[PDB]
């Protein structure tokens, strides 16, 4: 019963990247997702001789609260909320708006 | 693997158990050296043995 999953395309409700869109890369146990291209930070990576890392200002993706994102309904062209229902003895997610199953 | 191993005799089971243990030992020997570059194997095998042990206890007096 987790509304947002690894490979869902989502849209951001809040923050500096609000309105933007992206595929979820992975979701954390802490209640945070990392989405592709959305929340970017320019970490100063410390060089290390071992592991073949040179060291520089790497721009990587920082996590974002799940609440802050929303699963995008391609049909409506908008963010929607997710509900759960049993179809053929199997739980499936659906868009509250327009009531269509997520596939 | 428990369901597969359940369909066996006692003598069989004992042999595999021994075979698991010998492996374990080999891995331990490798691990101490710089040979073993697959650590999960140790974990696996230990679990495998415990499973067998369980299957022996179930068979004999349960």
């Amino acid at each position: 019963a987790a509304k947002i999953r690894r490979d869902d395309e989502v849209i951001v409700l809040t923050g500096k990247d609000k309105g933007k869109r992206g595929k979820v890369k992975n979701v954390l146990s802490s209640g945070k997702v990392i989405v592709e291209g959305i929340n970017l930070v320019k970490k100063h990576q410390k060089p290390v001789p071992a592991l073949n890392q040179p060291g520089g200002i790497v721009e990587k993706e920082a996590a974002i609260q799940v609440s802050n994102v929303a699963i995008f309904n391609a049909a409506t062209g908008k963010a929607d909320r997710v509900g759960f229902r049993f179809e053929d003895g199997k739980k499936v997610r659906f868009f509250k708006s327009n009531s269509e199953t997520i596939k | 693997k428990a369901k597969e191993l359940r369909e066996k005799s006692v003598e069989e089971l004992n042999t595999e158990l021994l075979n698991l243990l010998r492996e374990q030992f080999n891995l331990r020997m490798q691990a101490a050296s710089g040979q073993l570059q697959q650590s999960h194997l140790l974990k696996q095998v230990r679990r495998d043995v415990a499973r067998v042990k369980t299957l022996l206890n179930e068979k004999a007096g349960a």
Binding site: - | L18, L21, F25, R28, M29, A31, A32, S33
Partner: protein, 94 residues
């Protein structure tokens, strides 16, 4: 007569160190880490079976664990049993 399972569980590891290397090269003596509960005869039996090599004798000793300090917190390392196993003349071990 020692049970095979027990034998397998005896031997923890080879011990690498300068002294150990010297013992290997000169006196034909291997230095093993073994179970703390493992007695000498047991160790010998296990050597013979699992490395397939004749044993002259086993000396053992108990290594006490060092007290260390991780940050502010004190903590002690485990004690463990060392075994010098002298192997019969002409016995070459892999």
């Amino acid at each position: 007569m020692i049970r095979e399972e027990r034998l397998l569980k005896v031997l923890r590891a080879p011990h690498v160190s300068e002294k150990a290397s010297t013992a290997m090269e000169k006196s034909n003596t291997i230095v093993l880490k073994v179970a703390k509960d493992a007695t000498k005869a047991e160790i010998k039996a296990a050597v013979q079976k699992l490395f397939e090599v004749e044993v002259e004798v086993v000396n053992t000793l108990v290594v006490k664990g060092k007290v260390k300090r991780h940050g502010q917190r004190i903590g002690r390392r485990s004690d463990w049993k060392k075994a010098y196993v002298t192997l019969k003349e002409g016995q070459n071990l892999d």
